[PDB]
Design a protein around this ligand. Structure first.
Ligand SMILES: [Zn+2]
Ligand SMILES: [Zn+2]
Lengths: 67, 117, 121, 134, 74, 50
RNA sequence: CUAGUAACGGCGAGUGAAGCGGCAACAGCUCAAAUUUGAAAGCUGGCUUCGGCCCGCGUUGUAAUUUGGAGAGGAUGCUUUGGGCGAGGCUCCUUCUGAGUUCCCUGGAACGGGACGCCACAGAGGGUGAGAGCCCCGUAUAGUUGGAAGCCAAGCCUGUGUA
RNA sequence: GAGACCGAUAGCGCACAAGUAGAGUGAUCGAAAGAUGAAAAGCACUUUGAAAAGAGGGUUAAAUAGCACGUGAAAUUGUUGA
RNA sequence: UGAGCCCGGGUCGAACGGCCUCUAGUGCAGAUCUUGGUGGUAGUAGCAAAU
RNA sequence: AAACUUUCAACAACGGAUCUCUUGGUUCUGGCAUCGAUGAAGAACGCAGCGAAAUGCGAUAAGUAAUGUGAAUUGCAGAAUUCCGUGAAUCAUCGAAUCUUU
């Protein structure tokens, strides 16, 4: 149901979506590897996902999500 | 069909749920007044008049005097113990008599009559 | 000048009349002399007017109580001593008259009253 | 949330009832909390304020000022504390209107009816304490 | 003048020759009232005046149209 | 997935599980939901008129 | 709902029901036409010491009995009752009932921001010097204080007359 | 008791003196008009002069919030500069 | 491209905005349009009803 | 040259739009049934220290009595009027009264 949740997110409503008038949409989700709303970068509509985030200590981690 | 002044005679029904609440509270008031009694009276089974509805039956107005006498319920006691009486209806056949007599003895089998004092 | 109400309730008719007379005379004199240099006379005039109102109320109440004591067993009372209600409430049937029934109805209700019963499920 | 059908959550009706209230209702509205020591002593949280109470102002530009209430102006919904005053242009010292919700009563003007009020409030609070305990 | 003062409505609409008020019809017992003028009916309706007695009826209804005095009254 | 774990009052699982109903495998149709919600949100409306 | 059907109409404009069926609510009765005729047994007033006394109405008919899916009269043998107090209860007004004005900053004013808490069957609403659950009024829930009028009522007194 | 209503040219004619002021012989017709500030603390006093007016000075967080009072558009107008 | 939108500077003093849907009393240059305000004519004609 | 006319900017006017507000309207829903010859609805005249409006009241006249609450009213002026009290109040309730001319 990756495709169905993608259709619901992309075509109806997503709380992490920033719609700009300049030709690009942005993803407000913290686990998005690129802050852009597209099919490949969605942390929710992709069951297997991976991102890179930096802690307040300065240590950088890789986050992996499985189905 | 708007030839007449229909503007002055439009009836809306925004008070439908409020009237349903009013009807339910009226039934509750009837229950409060008649506390162990049912809020309804017992009514007979009658056949629908026309040939179109002859196959089905419905509830009548009140039991015939012959039906009450055959069931063993006196005429004057019957309205005071929850049974409706209709003096206009006639039986005309041995099959409505038996059905409503069975209904009356079934009502008698499940009745808790209290003494006067 | 200022008189409380219960003290007036204790006294009788001729007494209440003589305080009424002296209060009226004081009010008349103060109204005559109040046209020049009205200082603290205004509050006293207002208090005296309220005092006359209180005395008149007490005498009226005592007189109407005595009149009601007179008419305790008499059939007709004066219209001032009758309850007002409304015009329609004064014209409706009395409780004794409206609750009256015929003898046939009374016999039927006596021997065949509405009974208490319960249909068990 | 209100449940009783007689209560109204209308802002319009509430504002009209507040600003067009009688003098006794205004007395009830113009109430002040008791001090900590008086709250443990009488088991009463707040009382309607009256002339002769000694209060401390806990809000506004006149914070931490104490004094005796010399006027309860119900029409203007304000009390006048002693020595918490102002100066006009001419130099007259006018009182400063302080809301009774901004003060804390440190000393009550104890009469018989005030003791009856305190007793009734204490009885209700202790009977609810009994209901909570068991 | 054509019209003089009327006793019933207090307006200067009583015809000086016919002796009949043009606003209320004073010699007639019934006050003049017509359904083709709602404005005229609302200028003299029950509620546009002082209500000396009709304003006291609801409070008397609220307590059941009772008589007497409370117990312990003086 | 056939079962869903049950959690205690402390937030930790009790060890018991429940069978997931069929209604969680129903089709997810945002168009039907949009239609019925648009209709149903209008049903508590009080009339207004001049 | 029947039903824009039947029916009617410069048969054009059109006008336009009802029975049945489903439901809401249900409740039945009073007289006139009889002779009480072994007893006007009925009623409005006035006087009252309030208990019973007078005048009048009325026989050209006031009570009782009866009202046609009825009824009366006899016989018959079973089955039914009437009044007066009344504790208390319901309805409605009323009294009372939770918790921060803790510390810092900004600001004329904190009801704003930060920190640490508390109440919640109460985070409806309003006021308070700016967005206040805990400053105030109220709000929620069961109670509780006093009162008003109706109705119901456990019980307690009595019943009576060949009714 | 409420609302997916209207918000002072709107919503009742009337949020305020509203069936009022006012018009008509009369039957009748029928307006316009809300907002200082948290609090009047509503400008003391000195000084021009006859003003519903100024200059100092004061209150206020603020007076370019001064009962012509929240904000203060445009049409239109005056002073200065180009 | 455009209807428009975003930011700076000043004034101001209590609320407001984007996005996805829903809803409508939803967009003005004109109607001898309605209401209010304000002009040239014009400090002109004239001292006329009102003022 | 000066004067006049036009455009632009700053400031000051005129005017009251815009924004924000709202003890108002409007529409819906629920409980209840209560005017008058025992004088109604309506009209008029009066009552307060300063009352112009509005409201309240009727020669007992911004009101009297009774009950309840419990310390005010308030724009200014006045009270030797009341604060462990049958008791303030432009208070609330309200069963007793007064209630001018129509
Ligand atoms: Zn996305
Ligand atoms: Zn007239």
């Amino acid at each position: 149901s990756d495709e169905i949740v993608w259709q619901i997110i992309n075509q109806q409503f997503c709380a992490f979506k920033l719609k700009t008038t300049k030709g690009q949409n942005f993803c407000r989700n913290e686990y998005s590897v690129s802050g852009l709303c597209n099919r490949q970068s969605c942390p929710l509509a992709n069951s297997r996902y991976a991102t890179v985030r930096q802690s307040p200590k300065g240590t950088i981690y890789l986050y992996i999500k499985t189905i | 069909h708007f030839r007449k002044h229909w503007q002055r005679r439009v009836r809306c029904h925004f008070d439908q749920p409020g009237k349903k609440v009013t009807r339910r509270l009226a039934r509750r008031a009837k229950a409060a007044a008649l506390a162990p009694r049912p809020v309804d009276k017992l009514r007979p089974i009658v056949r629908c008049p026309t040939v179109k509805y002859n196959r089905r039956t419905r509830l009548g107005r009140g039991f015939t005097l012959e039906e009450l006498k055959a069931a063993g319920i006196p005429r004057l006691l019957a309205p005071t113990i929850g049974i409706a009486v209709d003096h206009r209806r006639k039986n005309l056949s041995e099959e409505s008599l038996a059905a409503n007599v069975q209904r009356l003895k079934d009502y008698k089998a499940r009745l808790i009559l209290f003494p006067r004092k | 000048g200022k008189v409380k109400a219960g003290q007036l309730w204790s006294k009788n008719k001729e007494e209440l009349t003589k305080i009424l007379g002296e209060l009226k005379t004081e009010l008349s004199q103060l109204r005559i002399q109040k046209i020049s240099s009205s200082g603290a006379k205004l509050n006293k005039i207002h208090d005296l007017r309220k005092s006359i109102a209180r005395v008149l109320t007490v005498i009226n109440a005592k007189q109407r109580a005595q009149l009601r004591l007179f008419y305790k067993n008499k059939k007709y009372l004066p219209l001032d001593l009758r309850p007002k209600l409304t015009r329609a409430l004064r014209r409706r049937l009395s409780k004794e008259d409206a609750s009256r029934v015929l003898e046939k109805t009374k016999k039927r209700l006596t021997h065949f009253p509405q009974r208490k019963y319960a249909v068990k499920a | 949330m209100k449940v009783r059908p007689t209560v109204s959550s209308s802002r319009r009706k509430a504002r009209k009832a507040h600003f067009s209230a009688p003098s006794s209702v205004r007395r009830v509205i113009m109430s002040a909390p008791l001090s900590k020591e008086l709250r443990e002593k009488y088991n009463v949280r707040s009382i309607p304020i009256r002339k002769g109470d000694e209060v401390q102002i806990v809000r506004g530009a006149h914070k931490d000022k104490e004094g005796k209430v010399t006027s309860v102006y119900r029409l203007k919904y304000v009390i006048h504390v002693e020595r918490v005053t102002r100066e006009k242009a001419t130099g007259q010292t006018v009182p400063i209107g302080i809301h009774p919700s901004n003060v804390v009563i440190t000393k009550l003007h104890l009469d018989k009816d005030r003791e009856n009020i305190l007793a009734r409030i204490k009885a209700g609070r202790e009977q609810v304490a009994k209901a909570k305990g068991k | 003048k054509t019209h003089g003062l009327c006793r019933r409505c207090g307006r200067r609409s009583l015809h000086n020759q016919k002796k009949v008020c043009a606003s209320c019809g004073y010699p007639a017992a019934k006050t003049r009232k017509y359904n083709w003028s709602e404005k005229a009916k609302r200028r003299k309706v029950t509620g546009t005046g002082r209500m000396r007695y009709l304003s006291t009826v609801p409070r008397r209804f609220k307590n059941g149209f009772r008589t007497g005095v409370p117990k312990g009254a003086r | 997935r056939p079962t869903v774990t049950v959690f205690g009052a402390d937030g930790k699982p009790t060890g018991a599980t429940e069978v997931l109903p069929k209604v969680f495998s129903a089709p997810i149709r945002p168009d039907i939901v949009k239609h019925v919600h648009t209709g149903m949100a209008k049903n508590k409306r009080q009339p207004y008129a001049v």
